[PDB]
Amino acid sequence: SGHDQSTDVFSAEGRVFQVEYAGKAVDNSSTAVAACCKDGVVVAVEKVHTSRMLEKGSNNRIHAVDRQAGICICGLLPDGRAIVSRARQEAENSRDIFATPIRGSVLANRVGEFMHAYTTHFAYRPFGCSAIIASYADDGPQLFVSDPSGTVAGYYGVALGKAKTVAKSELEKLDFSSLTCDEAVGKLASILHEVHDKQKDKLYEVEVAWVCDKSDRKFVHVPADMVPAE
């Protein structure tokens, strides 16, 4: 009927249909995966090129938010850009007002709170992107996920994208208590190649970033010659 046209309308069973439709658009995006490896975090995203003339470095989904925290936006790229800019405004304030790096959990809480102020009003539409926040503050490595519903949750290993179930069945069998980032940048990168179907999209490429002690606790992109070829 009309009970599924605006974000301010509970269904007959108390469901906000528009947010389920929003999450449906994230369920159809490029694959991403992430691991919190007790000494650092590693996020790795699939970039599906629609064109073979695209310069390498275009449509990079992993964006730095502070020195130590980064965001991988699986879903609609423009909306992810808005969330990345809001997280950047939240992280610069704590570095300005409170003279301290923003703790990872606080950043995830704020990003979720901002994603949820768009699913209460009749004049906005819910963000069509799920964020993966990877932070390493003075509280240890932290990996959080935010759904278009605005709900945050901390993980050890998380999978997103179109191929989300089979790519998650890979993360169950890693150890995550002895797993080191230096080998996780190989493990997750190989997981994405195993889960990636190649008779739909002829052009694809894996882009991975990490923040651990080796990078001086800074969120940077992986050295180019650290990802296995295929």
């Binding site: 470095g57 964006h63 730095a64 502070d66 020195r67 950047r88 610069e92 300005d96």
Partner: protein, 218 residues
């Protein structure tokens, strides 16, 4: 609180900026062990004369801008001349609001050959030379640096310029009331700015004309 004087000079290949490590409260030497040389980004450095709060706020505001710009977007970090330009525009904008940033700054920087040394007042005036000096260093120190430049315009050496920096710091110690004998020299070469450990310049107080009998007004 308020800093002292700053002097700076360009030699063959780099810049040198010397400043005393002391903050005064009017006539009282309050804190003699604080660093007054800040360094912004990975190519440039700054040092201010006068009120410390204003320099502390302005340097923070122009150090947040550099790192964010470089971290958000995949761009090269700002050159010395451009971060100085931003510094100057922000000082002028604070002055138009009758909210002055009451400190004369000296700004040095080196990026792959193009060595840069500028100075900015608090009213918005900016300039650039081969020798800068603020506070009282503009009167006492600056003439010595200018003569040491013109006596050999080909370009000083690093040691031959450190010598004259010591020789002007000595006079600044002699003839400036609110100053102490513990300075710092930030040296900016192609690799990048490098602040030295505090050092002291030797003095001389044993002229014969200072004897008790001679200086006596009986």
């Amino acid at each position: 609180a308020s800093g002292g004087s700053v002097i700076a000079i360009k030699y063959k290949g780099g810049v040198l900026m010397a400043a005393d490590t002391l903050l005064s409260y009017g006539s009282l030497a309050k804190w003699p062990n604080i660093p007054r040389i800040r360094l912004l980004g990975s190519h440039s450095a700054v040092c201010a004369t006068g009120s410390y709060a204003d320099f502390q706020m302005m340097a923070k505001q122009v150090e947040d801008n550099i790192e964010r710009q470089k971290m958000y977007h995949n761009v090269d970090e700002l050159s010395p001349s451009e971060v100085f330009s931003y510094l100057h525009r922000s000082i002028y904008q604070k002055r138009c609001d009758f909210d002055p940033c009451l400190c004369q700054m000296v700004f040095i920087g080196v990026r792959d050959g193009e060595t840069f040394l500028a100075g900015v007042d608090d009213v918005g005036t900016r300039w650039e030379d081969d020798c800068i000096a603020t506070g009282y260093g503009a009167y006492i120190a600056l003439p010595l640096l200018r003569q040491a430049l013109e006596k050999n315009p080909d370009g000083l050496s690093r040691g031959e310029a450190m010598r004259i920096l010591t020789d002007c710091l000595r006079v600044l110690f002699y003839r400036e009331c609110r100053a102490i004998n513990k300075f710092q020299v930030a040296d900016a070469a192609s690799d990048g700015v490098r602040i030295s450990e505090p050092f002291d310049v030797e003095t001389h107080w044993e002229y014969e004309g200072y004897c008790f009998e001679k200086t006596a007004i009986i």
